[PDB]
Amino acid sequence: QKPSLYRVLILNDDYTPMEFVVYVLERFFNKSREDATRIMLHVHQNGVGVCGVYTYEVAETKVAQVIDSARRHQHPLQCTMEKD
Numbered sequence: 001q002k003p004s005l006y007r008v009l010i011l012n013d014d015y016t017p018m019e020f021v022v023y024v025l026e027r028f029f030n031k032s033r034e035d036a037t038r039i040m041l042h043v044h045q046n047g048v049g050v051c052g053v054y055t056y057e058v059a060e061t062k063v064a065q066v067i068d069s070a071r072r073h074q075h076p077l078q079c080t081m082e083k084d
Contacts, residue, residue, distance in 0.1 A: 003084065004055075004056070004083075005053045005054060005055060005056075005059075005083075005084045006053065006054060006055070006056055006059040006081045006082060006083055006084055007050050007051075007052070007053045007059075007081065007082060007083075007084045008029070008050070008051040008052055008053075008054065008059050008062055008063055008066075008079065008080075008081045009048055009049065009050060009051065009079065009080050009081065009082070010024070010025075010039075010043050010048070010049050010051055010066065010077065010078070010079050011043070011047065011048050011077075011078040011079070011080070012043045012044060012046075012047045012048065012049075013075075013076050013077060013078065015075060015076050016070065016075040016076060016077040017075070018040055018044065020070070020073055020075055020077070021036075021040045021043060021044075021077070022036045022037060022040050024066050024069060024070075024077075024079075025039055025040060025051060028051075028062050028065045028066055028069070029051045029052050029062065030052075031051075031052075039051065051066075051079075053084045059081040060081065062081075063079050063080060063081050066079040067079050
């Protein structure tokens with residue numbers, strides 16, 4: 001076998017509003033309010049949070065969605081993906 005899915009990470013920063021991060025989790029990562037909150041607080045407290053695991057194509061898409069959204073909202077939020 002060769003598991004080839006990819007996890008999407010959101011990194012913490014001191015400028016992006018908590019509310020925005022919850023928004024990106026609920027929309028771009030299909031998270032419920034409870035799960036989006038959990039992950040958001042994990043980012044805020046631990047410095048990084050796992051948004052989910054997807055195929056390469058989907059991960060690449062969602063990462064782009066997150067950062068594009070962040071910039072359009074004028075936040076410095078960073079997002080990236082790597083092999084699960």
